[PDB]
Predict the structure of Ryanodine receptor 1.
Amino acid sequence: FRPYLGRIEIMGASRRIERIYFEISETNRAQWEMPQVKESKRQFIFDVVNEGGEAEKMELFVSFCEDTIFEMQIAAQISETAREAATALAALLWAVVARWGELEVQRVKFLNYLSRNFYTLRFLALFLAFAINFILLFYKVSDSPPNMVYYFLEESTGYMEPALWCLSLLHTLVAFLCIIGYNCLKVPLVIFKREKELARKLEFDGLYITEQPGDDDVKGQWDRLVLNTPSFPSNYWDKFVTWLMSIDVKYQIWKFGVIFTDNSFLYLGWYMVMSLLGHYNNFFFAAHLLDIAMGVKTLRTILSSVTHNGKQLVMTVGLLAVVVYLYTVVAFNFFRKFYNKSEDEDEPDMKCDDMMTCYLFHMYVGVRAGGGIGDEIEDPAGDEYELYRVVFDITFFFFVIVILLAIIQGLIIDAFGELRDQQEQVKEDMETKCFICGIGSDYFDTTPHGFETHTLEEHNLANYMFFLMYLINKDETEHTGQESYVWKMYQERCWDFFPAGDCFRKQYEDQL
Amino acid sequence: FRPYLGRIEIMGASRRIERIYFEISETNRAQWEMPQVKESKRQFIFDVVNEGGEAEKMELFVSFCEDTIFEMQIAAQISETAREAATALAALLWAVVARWGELEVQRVKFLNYLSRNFYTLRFLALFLAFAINFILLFYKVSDSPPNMVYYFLEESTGYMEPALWCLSLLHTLVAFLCIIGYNCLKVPLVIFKREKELARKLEFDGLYITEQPGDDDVKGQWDRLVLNTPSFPSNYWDKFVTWLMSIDVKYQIWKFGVIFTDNSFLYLGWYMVMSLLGHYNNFFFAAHLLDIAMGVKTLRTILSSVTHNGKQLVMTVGLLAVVVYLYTVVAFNFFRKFYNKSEDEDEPDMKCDDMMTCYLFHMYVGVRAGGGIGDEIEDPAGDEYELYRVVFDITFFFFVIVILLAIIQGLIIDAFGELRDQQEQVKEDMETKCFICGIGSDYFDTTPHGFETHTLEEHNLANYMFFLMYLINKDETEHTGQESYVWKMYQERCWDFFPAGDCFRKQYEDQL
Amino acid sequence: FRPYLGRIEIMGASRRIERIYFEISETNRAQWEMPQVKESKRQFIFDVVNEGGEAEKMELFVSFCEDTIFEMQIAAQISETAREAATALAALLWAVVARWGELEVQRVKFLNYLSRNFYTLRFLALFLAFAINFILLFYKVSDSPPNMVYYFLEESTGYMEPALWCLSLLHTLVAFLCIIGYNCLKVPLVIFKREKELARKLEFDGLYITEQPGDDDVKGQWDRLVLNTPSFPSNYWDKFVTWLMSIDVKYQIWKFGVIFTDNSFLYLGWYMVMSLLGHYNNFFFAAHLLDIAMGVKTLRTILSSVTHNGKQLVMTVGLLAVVVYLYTVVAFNFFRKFYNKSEDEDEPDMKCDDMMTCYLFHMYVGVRAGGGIGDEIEDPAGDEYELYRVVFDITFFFFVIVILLAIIQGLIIDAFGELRDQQEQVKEDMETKCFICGIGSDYFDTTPHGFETHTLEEHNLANYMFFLMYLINKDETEHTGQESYVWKMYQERCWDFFPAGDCFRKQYEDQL
Amino acid sequence: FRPYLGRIEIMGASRRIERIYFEISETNRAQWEMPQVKESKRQFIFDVVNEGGEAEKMELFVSFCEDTIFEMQIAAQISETAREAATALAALLWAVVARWGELEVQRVKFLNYLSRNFYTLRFLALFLAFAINFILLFYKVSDSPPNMVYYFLEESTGYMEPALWCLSLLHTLVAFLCIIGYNCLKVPLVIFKREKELARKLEFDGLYITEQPGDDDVKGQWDRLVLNTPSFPSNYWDKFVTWLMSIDVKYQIWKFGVIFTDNSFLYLGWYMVMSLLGHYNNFFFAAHLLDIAMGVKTLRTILSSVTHNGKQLVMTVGLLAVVVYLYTVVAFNFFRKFYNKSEDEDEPDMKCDDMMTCYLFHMYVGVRAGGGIGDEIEDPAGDEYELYRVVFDITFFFFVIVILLAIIQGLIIDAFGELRDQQEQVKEDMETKCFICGIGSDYFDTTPHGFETHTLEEHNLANYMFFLMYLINKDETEHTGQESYVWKMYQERCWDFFPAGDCFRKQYEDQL
């Protein structure tokens, strides 16, 4: 019974580590192989290692375990020429990106079918958006019929317009299907997470009964309504913390408040509204190309690097604006005659006659010039302010290009590199120090495959998760002494039963 | 009595750590919550961790404690279209930047009121300067009446000029109020710091009595006058180290010498003189925009990065100047005919006929070109020196752009990154190793919330500060044995009473 | 007998380290000095240290030892004006780069002669290619005889064309000789490596007998034919795992499948086909200049840096393409009139009338401009969309130049630096921690020249290799107890006989 | 007798550390304060810490001690508008840069006077060169009298030409004086160093008597003549390893061979020859401006960064040349018509008609363009090879600008940063781990000012140096037991008498 037996180590009343054996049913291990729960697990370890909250690590692990229980129970419910180059480039890009009662029963079966393949639905939506964007590359504009008129250039196939129309139709349909699948699959997970957070806060902190909700807490203030609900716990296990009559209005608006406040739900709603707007104008479908950035981990890291140092970037942009304003002040006061940008002398284009123009001209040209503001303005040849302009142009070029723009670029690059290094450090910590007790890697490295054996069966996270399922399923009376102790102390919400400092090998190294 | 009881650990005559309990009055803990003293505290730990002076760490801590006593006693005395885009950008910028006897009594009350809100006064001055600068963006120039004449463009509101005049008036008034508040609030702090430094030097080093003041010490030489003063100690506690008759002239000029030598006082005087000059010309108010750079920590770090490697930057600039001079020598000797910058052949603009022109032209164009001096000068097509110019232009472009400018930019970026890393390391050390004894983080990390308990009550800096207040207030006779010992050895100015290597937990780990 | 005596340390049945002495013949040590085996050794340590496979380190060492045995047995079988500047540059470059039965007997002697000097043959081929490329620099084109006609400019020597023809002839001949030498020298090595891998897999894993070959394994599926061969082991020692009749067809096609799947053989075949194509057009010889990149370690690292982050680079390129497509969409929808690139107004060159042109124009100009797409397009002077274009051009310039291109350049630079740092770390580990037991450097550093003595004789890799040769040559009956034990346990393919944790010095430090 | 007493720690026959006291004469400590010996000391520690030769550290220290003895004995023998901006810039630059028998007796006194102030003489030479270069900035050229004629522009002072002539005269005179001072001051030091190296090699290695001098050793082969000299040891202490008659010819040419092979002597000879050439043409004095680069440590590091990665830089330049040659091949074969650089169509300037022109044009324009070769060549508008040129220009721009030039710039920047980090690490090691025994910093940091006391008197390098002087001066008979033992074992040239692992504090920590 190698795959039906699980080994876990807990510290008991004896103040020493003790390994116990519990039966693992095939159903519990079967649900662990779903890609969704595996991705959630990887996200959990990534987040906890990045945060570094060792003190609250056990609480986060327990929350992750409860989230896994909810995910697998949900899965149980849902269980049954130039165009040639353009085509080549699109194919190359796609490739990597690639890499009564009976009516109610039918409706819930269709909803479960939609929930079963939701990532596949998102992939199909991405493919439809990519195809639509590729089709849009053939658009042409001309005054003559096929004001400005946008038409399609005559292609060899000739089926371009009906193909685009059909692709837009299935794109809208698949966006609706994806939002329905998300509402029926991942929305209950966040609903249960918020209900558990509220229940724990009310039970162990008195957030409402023993204290005020507080200030600057939208979630806390909004959560005020759930308490009076006849069903405050609906997606959380602890339930003791005719369709119109059964539905409770306050619970419905509360739950809706949870959904529309979710980031993923908001993103999917934005996708749906962009798909709807794409019918008014086909060029609106280009907004769906951003799903490549979110889907790819590297592109997501690139996007997050911009907001990683948002405060510092904003401060640097403000400093650059102040510096450019000072230089514009100096130019307006002393160097107005050098800002003529018209070749013809009949109508000179004075760019520094007004301060806003001198400011807009500076901010648009000097920053992007790469050699300073002196390149655009007239060269100081024979002027009485020759040394003064030369100094002005050298100082502007230096202080802007070599410092201000360089600082911003270095900040963005450093944020991206820091995020990549954080991911690499998370991976190295996971493959070096085990998650359960975090003992040194060399101690197990002395024994051949010591760390592999320590993580596979001795301190496997899946083993503890399956132990939690087994404790939940098994009755209190049938629990053994160690099982009863661990269950009673788990209901106490105090996690010192983990191996913590040491394991079985360290305790009895001489015996082993 | 949880908040009225303080626990501190000191090493006594028994050569072992010993925790003692002292009563904490509510008044002492109340004054600790002022933002000014908290900011001074953060600055103190930042400076001491950056310096790394572990040997003199206790002396710096004692000096900080005395400065806190003086700060809280002072607080006790003072205790009672295009314009739409421009508006949007200004609002966004501002946002972050933001985020007889009776007469004498009235005068001192007004002065205390000014001192109470000094940071708020500085914020109001910054807002006034920002508003004035925003107003100045609408300035326009034209020969015709509203020589060159500067007038205001016709705006929709039409209240622009009176608003600017009033804003300048309140800007000058608030600058005067801010300088008065600084003179009445922070000037006594630096006065007391200098008086304590002088007293300690005279008592424990014989800087004047037992030795010469020295050379290249402006502060030491100037401090010569305070000694003869009938009031050498005026803002320092150790006093034993009719208005015209009461005031001592020598003390007055000495104190004034302290004030005008202060960096912050000099900066505020520069602000005041710029505000005064702004009435002569409204464009002079742009100098006040630099307060954004000083106020923001990131912008202050950016400014300090320039001067962090000032010597290396100056040496690199000198090397670049020497290289450009050598290239100018070569061009003047061999490549004079290639420096014609006039399209019309009637009046050629020979830029290398004179060595200073060839030098000024090189230093202005070749550095900022980004592709070398060869871009500006005529291309060597068919010339007898084709290979020689090509080599000259390649060598110039390489040695300047790829090396000299790159070295300067990398030096600035490295200075900025080093300052940011120093701040991050200071923060990590503060949140990892406690300031009092500096024991390892893992030792307390073995016990859950061990470091938090160790820093909150076991080795709290505020606890030692409150103990110092309690010792100062309590009489010598009422002092206990440990209190008398610590007071007598504090008057000895020798700080080995700190826990130093170990604490209570390490000493009696088995018992605990 | 200093050079004829070898000392090695092994752990035996006594569970303690034990050094034994074995006779080293001069023949075994003589073959160790060949540059080929030394380069293979350096590559082996570099690869194993870079991989970091400590658990499989001993298996890799045993494989390297077997490869060395095969290499030395193979060696036993084969044992017996502007042109002046161009010339100066070519010489400087080359320098650094520089740095019946009797018939069968004659044929095998010629083949052995070719195999003896193969690196020299490659160097001669590189010299011939460099000379041909230098000759090609004098090519000129003109319509007139010596359609477009390519001829040779009249040189002072006048022997240019016959020299080029002869150089091409010997280049083709030396390419053929090099491919023959590689087939007769290094092809048997890879053949033996694949045969040993197959034998080990079949013996210890049941890859075919006890299991399926698997999926996505071209080598495993192709290796299916060798099994039925009457000679499955031909270049592997374990042989028990009329020319037409002797040759086995299945073995011949299997072996050929091994050769044409080799990277080095494929590269040499590409070299040969390029040499053959160079006769059709002499400009095809420029492909042979890539051998400089492969030959030089620094240039090879530079090339490998591009593919080190290939996935991230592809993702970044895709993100850049998506961003440029979005900007092209915006320009086509709103800023079509600003894309006129024709000076003459009679025939405007509308670059954004068609979406593909606007996309191709963007991807070709905006990326390489360095200041954004605004430089190429007309300046927005007086247009109703002045603020909108300014924002468009600033956002494009920022998001492309400062982020997208900077990220790609930083990724390439970081990959190159990471490869260089990996090589430096491999070297530091080799010169700091010995390969055999990996004890600390300081422990031997306490004793003067402790590490040198520990690596020269105590734990020399060459010593273990020579011990392996001595065990192979010596009969089983004549083996000593330790030798018999090590041989029997080596046939068990379990490598715990290495010193592993400790050596002789650590075991008996007090005695020593 | 605090400054006349020295404490050193040595390990004796008892195998334990033992501190002994020796009398320090005032003369020995007086000579230690010369700036020359201090700079030599700093250079010695910098070099030894950078090298990391712990095994040979004691030998290097002994060599440094002997060099100090020779330096102090030598000192004993020698002991007795636009021009306004240009002036401001020159002053600012200079500032930082700033920061019978009786006849023989007179000649040797003059030589000693020259040797006494040699750094001052070099500073005066640098000032003269800077003044001459500043004067040269006023040169002007014109056809008319004051072929091309170089004259001086009319200045306000009018004394420019005689001042320049006099400055050149004293520059030549001071260069001669500096070379004489170097010959009489530092040349004997290198002579003694080479004589000691030869003596040690002959005594302890048999470089000539017991073996051949070797190959690729210019110093070893040249040193062959000194052996037969009647005075092989002339500047080395171990002398037992009529002017025309006294001088030995072979020794004279040998010594001259030592001098002209020295780097500093060669640099000073180059300075002298440049000064001599400056009289023929005053513009030749610009070569002396390089002394700023050598004098300043930062500028010297900048110069050394170029040659730090010389091999890698050469390989990268060769790879860039090969890539540019391949691109030129492609352009010549397919894109010849796009290389017209003449605005007038009457005489097109075909830049790719000849391969060398296409190669020279590519290497001069594409590298320095910053946007690729596509900017200079005609835009592909409507051509049949539109996609092919676009791909060609994108690939060229990427592979050159983003990779090849970026790699070179990053290599130079990394070399400079590595040199700066090496200097910083040397400083940190010196201020953290003492040079003598290298014990941990924390061990002495436990005791207040423990490291300061450990380095000032316990393990002072100057203390060991003064002990060496005292042993040299004191007779063998008067030596004490420890002194006799250390002297006899120093003549054995084996340095295990250093404290090495531990010191007095570690040996008797309980007693202390």
User: Anything to note?
Assistant: The two ends of chain D are 24 Å apart (CA to CA).
